Amino acid sequence: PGSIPLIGERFPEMEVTTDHGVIKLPDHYVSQGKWFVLFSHPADFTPVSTTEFVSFARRYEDFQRLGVDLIGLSVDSVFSHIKWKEWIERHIGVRIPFPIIADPQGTVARRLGLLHAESATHTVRGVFIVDARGVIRTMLYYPMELGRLVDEILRIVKALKLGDSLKRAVPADWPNNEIIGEGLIVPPPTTEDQARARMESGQYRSLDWWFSWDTPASRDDVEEARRYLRRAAEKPAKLLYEEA
Amino acid sequence: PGSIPLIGERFPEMEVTTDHGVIKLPDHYVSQGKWFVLFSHPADFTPVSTTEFVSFARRYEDFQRLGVDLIGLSVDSVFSHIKWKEWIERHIGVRIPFPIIADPQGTVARRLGLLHAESATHTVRGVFIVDARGVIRTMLYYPMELGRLVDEILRIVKALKLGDSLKRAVPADWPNNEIIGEGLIVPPPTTEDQARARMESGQYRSLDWWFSWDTPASRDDVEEARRYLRRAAEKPAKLLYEEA
Amino acid sequence: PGSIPLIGERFPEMEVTTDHGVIKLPDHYVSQGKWFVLFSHPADFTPVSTTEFVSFARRYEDFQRLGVDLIGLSVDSVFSHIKWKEWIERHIGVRIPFPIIADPQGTVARRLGLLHAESATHTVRGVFIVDARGVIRTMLYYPMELGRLVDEILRIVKALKLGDSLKRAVPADWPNNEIIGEGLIVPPPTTEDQARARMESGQYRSLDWWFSWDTPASRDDVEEARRYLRRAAEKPAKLLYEEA
Amino acid sequence: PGSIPLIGERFPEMEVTTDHGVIKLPDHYVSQGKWFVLFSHPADFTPVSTTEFVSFARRYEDFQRLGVDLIGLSVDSVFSHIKWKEWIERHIGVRIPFPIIADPQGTVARRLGLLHAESATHTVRGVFIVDARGVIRTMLYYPMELGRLVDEILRIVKALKLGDSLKRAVPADWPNNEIIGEGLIVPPPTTEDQARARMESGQYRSLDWWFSWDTPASRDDVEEARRYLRRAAEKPAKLLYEEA
Amino acid sequence: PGSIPLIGERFPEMEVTTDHGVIKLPDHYVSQGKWFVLFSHPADFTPVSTTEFVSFARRYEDFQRLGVDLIGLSVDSVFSHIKWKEWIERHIGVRIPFPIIADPQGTVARRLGLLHAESATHTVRGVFIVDARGVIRTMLYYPMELGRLVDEILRIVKALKLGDSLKRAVPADWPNNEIIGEGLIVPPPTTEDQARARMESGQYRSLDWWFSWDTPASRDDVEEARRYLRRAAEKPAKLLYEEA
Amino acid sequence: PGSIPLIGERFPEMEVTTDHGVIKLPDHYVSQGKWFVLFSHPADFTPVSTTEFVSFARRYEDFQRLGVDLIGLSVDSVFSHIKWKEWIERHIGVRIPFPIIADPQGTVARRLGLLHAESATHTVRGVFIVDARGVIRTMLYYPMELGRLVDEILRIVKALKLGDSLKRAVPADWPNNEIIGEGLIVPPPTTEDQARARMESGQYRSLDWWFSWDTPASRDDVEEARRYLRRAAEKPAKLLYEEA
Amino acid sequence: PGSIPLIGERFPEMEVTTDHGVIKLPDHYVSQGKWFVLFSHPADFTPVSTTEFVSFARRYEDFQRLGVDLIGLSVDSVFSHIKWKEWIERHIGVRIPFPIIADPQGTVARRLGLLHAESATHTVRGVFIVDARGVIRTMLYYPMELGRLVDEILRIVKALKLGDSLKRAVPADWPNNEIIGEGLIVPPPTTEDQARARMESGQYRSLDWWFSWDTPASRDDVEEARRYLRRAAEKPAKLLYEEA
Amino acid sequence: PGSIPLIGERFPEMEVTTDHGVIKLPDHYVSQGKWFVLFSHPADFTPVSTTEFVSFARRYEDFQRLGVDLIGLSVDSVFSHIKWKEWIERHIGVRIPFPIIADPQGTVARRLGLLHAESATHTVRGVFIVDARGVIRTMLYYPMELGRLVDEILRIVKALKLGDSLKRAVPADWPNNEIIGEGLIVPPPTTEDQARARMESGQYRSLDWWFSWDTPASRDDVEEARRYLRRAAEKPAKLLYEEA
């Protein structure tokens, strides 16, 4: 087994070397009021990893609009990072705008539990979603053989920001939940008095005292979330390998 | 932080009490040649949890067609599991067909790293995708306030089964990858002799010796994966709260 | 196997989550000048546990008369506690007025020694009788298969309060002791001088210098205690399962 | 705090000196098919203790008819035990027929967790109810100042033996339960299939799938248990101190 | 083996419960200006122990004449102590005037090394002779099967007080020593200059520079010591069993 | 404090150097069917020690008649032992017939607990009475300033041998006990059935079921023990210094 | 092996009991500006040891004229020391003027590493030569079977004092060294510059830069040292055993 | 503050590198039936050390006559040993015939305790006298500033060999002892029987039972030992620095 940071913990304090320079996590992004998604890949010049870097780069403006910065990680050196990003820009025609952590002794990898049994030497495809207070909100661990669905990372951050600002919980498959649609859930009562007051208020649609909801998300917020999933579901019009 | 089992490890050997009786993991599923998805939720009679059970139940036949069984997990007793499943069938009209582990002292939760900093007493929304050899393939940790995207769990399993059977890696956002579309990736060469053989062979479309792909998935395999994402993306026609 | 708190010790300081909110023990009750009876049960929606909750609720006014508050405990969540108390009120017609502690990781159970060999996961039927100074006065440990005799819990508190106010020890089976009836015992001399002064004072009825008693309890206090045992011994006039 | 043996554990193996000779617990009783009640008291020639010995002696044939032996315990020596028992027979006219363990260094007291905070040197009024397999079934801890209700100890053993024999759980305040009277509880279903089958069966009176009961106890078993409580509730016509 | 306090150490600081009350040793006796003899016996209501309590009681005035207080010790409780002393006074006609320590968990016994291999649970027949400064002067350990010679304890105290008051050592069998009779010994020189001064002096009777003596004890001091031995050697005029 | 060997323990196995040669304890004496008295003294050429050696030597035939050998012990060398014994024979006219252990590093002294706080470097006047099984039966610790009463050591051995042979315990001050005289005590019953058999038998004089005695010792055995005490009590006819 | 003090270390601080009284080492001698020779012998009343004490005593004035005090040591008591020194003065006609340490528990012996494998309990024949600063300058360890050559101890102290005063090293067999006779050695150069300056100066007789000497000792100092060696070499004119 | 091997212990088993080759101690010499003298010096090319090597070399035939081999030791390498020996032969005209141990890491120095406080880096002038059984018989520790008296080493070996062959102890200053001259001491009696057997037999000259001697050494053995001391005491006829 191995050790990982946990949801609701502060992201571990660390100085990291990137191909943009040395930065302190999470302070670099907390300072700017930004969320960040830290994601790892096994090695530079690997093909699944390349497809994921191009996916993130294509969604860069969507991440930026949520106040989310992106930061990559692998055990490769900064020189490899710069050569690999140059290769992607020259051969796929896509600039990778975000920094990649160089972690050659796996110091960061070990701290974040990114070395699994699949490889003794390369990180799996981990994802840490970290809010502007530097708190870990979600963690995903995809394996070497499977690329991420990057639109689900956008949907997670959009839904978490909506929940934080509207004081709501977010149903399964939001904004297309089969029970309440684009509805958001009122956190359930935790006392007998809160439960009776909830039933007696009539202020929310409810199935029981513990299951109440309303529709407080803006049309634009729901449409932005729906766009991420529509993009995930769409057969591409053009394939980038066809351009060059 | 907290300890977790790891991708490529055998799922920890354990006897668990469910609302279907006592079973041994992973043996119960290994014996049937089935994959399983073990997922956790904080407490019975909680609303996001309820929406996720209904989503899984709706997708049950999709999981069964892949040869994937489902098993849930809460700190609640089997008596609460049975009363909550009865509630969902009576009030939402959806039978939950799969078992739920009862884990009152968090014995199972501690072994799977399901107790994070967000709650001292309730599991987060963990997902363990386990193959027919009992090997952990993917792990997701969603928080209390955010329901899962269950169609991404179907995509993961379908894509891992396709990678396993065709000996291919799966690009970002498959089957809608922006570079190669529904193409699957040939694992890169790891030696100079292999790199030269790849580049002289003419066998595969390639961008470089380390980035080769082909289109070995069937129309039916690709359409099955695209249907999961199209479902995720569709505004529901009818809401189940409307016929509660 | 199993540490427990002990008679004569202050009840261990703890913050507990109930279906009435968070309360500090024993301070919540000490601050009010109230005794409390903390009792546990294995799981909500279990039948022996339901019979005991109804027994305590039916005796609620007798506990109130003695200045005693009641507080339950099980490993189930507050959501299951609220749904189970709702079920009792709806199907048995008896409102459960007192709080239940939610103890899902057995944090409280472990501190009170309520996890025995009979179940790894569920508390036995423990009783802690705690006075208005926060001192543990009596502890009972009943098993899963046997309900408690709630009238003996009332007799204990009543006798302990009488002992405390009158400076007396209480004989077996009080107030129907076969030697001294409703008599209360003078704590025995612990010195030769004390023993002779006792034997010469003719102040008490005696069988020996170590066995003196008088009858200082009011007829009301005696009959109140006897009423608890008379109720325990009576066949119910009508069974609540009929008028349900 | 302090350590105790637990319900469902074998009574700790030990050789003990009594005023009947040296015996091995729990073997001495297991080998006869007998339950035993081991109870403690602080010291010989103390008045509450004497009332409890007389109460147990008065109920000796009731225990014997149930197949239950009695054994006492204090830190006094065997010579004091024999003198104290002689005193009770001569001054109260009640022979104490059962053995008392002599525990002068408190070896047994520490093993059984009978030294609480009320006294560093003398056991509280502990009770261990041990079945014929040598398993602890119930534990009570009464304090120095309060005599036990010996009829509740008979009710417990009677109710556990009925529950063992009939494969039933025993409601609160049996045989005068306010919901089901002398009814005994069918252990609840622990699976969905068991819950449905119970509800379809028509075999038992039910309030829900988890709350079924029948009336399988013999009229004699019910009348005996009611007789113990009637005796607890009734004022003796004659006090033994008057015929001293 | 076992640990003991040693000759020339202050008696261990200790609060003890006796049948006269709670007292601090050795402080209680140091404050009275008194030596004490602490002696132990295995258990109350034992025959050799009873003979020794009667022997000490008969010599009480001889201990008072030397400024010595007596204090007994066994593992029995204070109630047993008072009953046993009551038995001795009623059946043998001798009042026991001095206190007995009750030591039920062997706290005092373990500190004084009075638990030997002959019994795991009862003290042997230890004697600690403690002077008016609280210092241990002599220790005797008799076994269960052999009563002490109480006149030798009187001889030890008398001789130690004579040695202290006269700066003399006391020969074997004093005051009937076969070499020097009632003579007392001058502490030997420890330096060549002291040895020369001693041989040049003519002050004492001498067999060598290391063996000098004189007769500084009063005739009263000598004859009092001789009387203890003469009593030890005399056939009793009348046996107390005869006048029972 | 310091550790000591204990009554009922085998005398610790040790090879010792004496002025008679090297021997093993307790084997040397056990092999001959002998008891032994090991006694210690602070140093050779000290006057109280010299008086004790002469007293033991005067009694040596009394020890031999009992099957008891003597063995001394001090931290001085064998050369000092031989010179000192020669001095005693030449100046006092008494041959010391028994061996003395030489213990210069205090190996033996530390094993027997003979270094007390009175002296860091010299043994106190310890006495170990060891039976022919090699078992310690009594231990005495006299201080530097006070010679032993050697007749009490003969009385101990004689009484222990009589009690062992006759299966009797020995009263205080035997054979002049004030209650029973030259009576010996029947060990007390330890069970209710033995106590009844004793008080139904009529076979012994008794004060109670726990205090029975008879007179099984021979007139010669009683007269021999009284002779030791009469010798202790009588002023010697002639002092050895008067021809020294 | 065993631990010893080392040349160049301060003699260990210790209070010791001698036949002259208690003294602190090395302070007692350091205080007077005196060297001391501490020497040990196995035991008093041993013959090689007696010859050595007579040898030291014969040389006492030679040590006093160098400002060297003598102090002996054995595991015997001070009483044996005084009796043995008396024996020497009376039988040999030689007074032993210097103190002997009494070390009965071997505390000092163990501190100076004087217990070797030849004897578990008696010190070998050690010699500690200690200067007026309290520093150990030379250590000799002679065995039980071989007396020391006391004139070599004089030679060592005379040679060390001359070396210290004149800032010289002392050749083998000084003052009869076969290379330089009564010559004293100039400490060699330890640097290249020092070695060249030594050879360029022509201040001393030299065999090489590392081997220079001169003759700075007075005729009196040289004759004093040769006299010690002459005495060692010459058969005494008269043997002390004769004039007994 | 340093460990050394001890008299009567076997010389520590070790392989050492010498300027004659690798040899095992003490086996190399034991195998030949030879004693050896192992001696230490601080460093090669030091002047006191050179005087000692020349002294040993001049006495080499005397050591050979006694069956004693010589072995030196310093922390310098074998190359420095050979150059230094070459220097002594060329500049002093004396061949060093015996080996020197090279001990550059102080491995041998540390085993033999030859590193004292005078130097962290160089051995003091240690001497180990080792018999033909490999047993350490004597140890000398001379300091850096003082050469040894080699004739005393010859006298020790000659005297130990005489003692071993004649079963005698050797008096102080032998063969010029002031009491007994060239007499040798009979080991003292260690038992009373031996002491009486010695004083009855009149086979030896005696001052007491513990001081007997005879003259068993041949005149050759006595005069050979006296010759060593006479050589120590003589001014050299010719100083070696003269011719050099």
Curated annotation (Swiss-Prot), chains A, B, C, D, E, F, G, H:
| Induction / repression | Up-regulated by hydrogen peroxide (at protein level).
Q: Does the keyword Phosphoprotein apply?
A: no
Q: What GO molecular function terms would the record report?
A: antioxidant activity; identical protein binding; peroxiredoxin activity; thioredoxin peroxidase activity
Gene Ontology CC terms, in alphabetical order: cytosol
EC number, UniProt record: 1.11.1.24
Which GO biological-process labels does this protein carry? cell redox homeostasis; cellular response to hydrogen peroxide; hydrogen peroxide catabolic process
Q: Please give the positions of the paired cysteines in each disulfide bond.
A: S206-S212
Q: What is its main location?
A: cytoplasm
Quote the Pfam families the UniProt record gives: 1-cysPrx_C (PF10417), AhpC-TSA (PF00578)
Q: Which InterPro entries match?
A: AhpC/TSA, Peroxiredoxin, Peroxiredoxin_AhpC-typ, Peroxiredoxin_C, Peroxiredoxin_TDXH, PRX_1cys, Thioredoxin-like_sf, Thioredoxin_domain
PROSITE patterns found in the cross-reference section: THIOREDOXIN_2
Broad enzyme group: oxidoreductase
Anything else known: The active site is a conserved redox-active cysteine residue, the peroxidatic cysteine (C(P)), which makes the nucleophilic attack on the peroxide substrate. The peroxide oxidizes the C(P)-SH to cysteine sulfenic acid (C(P)-SOH), which then reacts with another cysteine residue, the resolving cysteine (C(R)), to form a disulfide bridge. The disulfide is subsequently reduced by an appropriate electron donor to complete the catalytic cycle.
Matching HAMAP family: Peroxiredoxin
PANTHER family, sorted: ALKYL HYDROPEROXIDE REDUCTASE C, THIOREDOXIN PEROXIDASE
Q: Which family does it belong to?
A: Belongs to the peroxiredoxin family. Prx6 subfamily.
Indicate what this protein is called per its UniProt record. Peroxiredoxin
Which species is the source of this protein? Aeropyrum pernix (strain ATCC 700893 / DSM 11879 / JCM 9820 / NBRC 100138 / K1)
Give the organism's phylogenetic lineage: Archaea, Thermoproteota, Thermoprotei, Desulfurococcales, Desulfurococcaceae
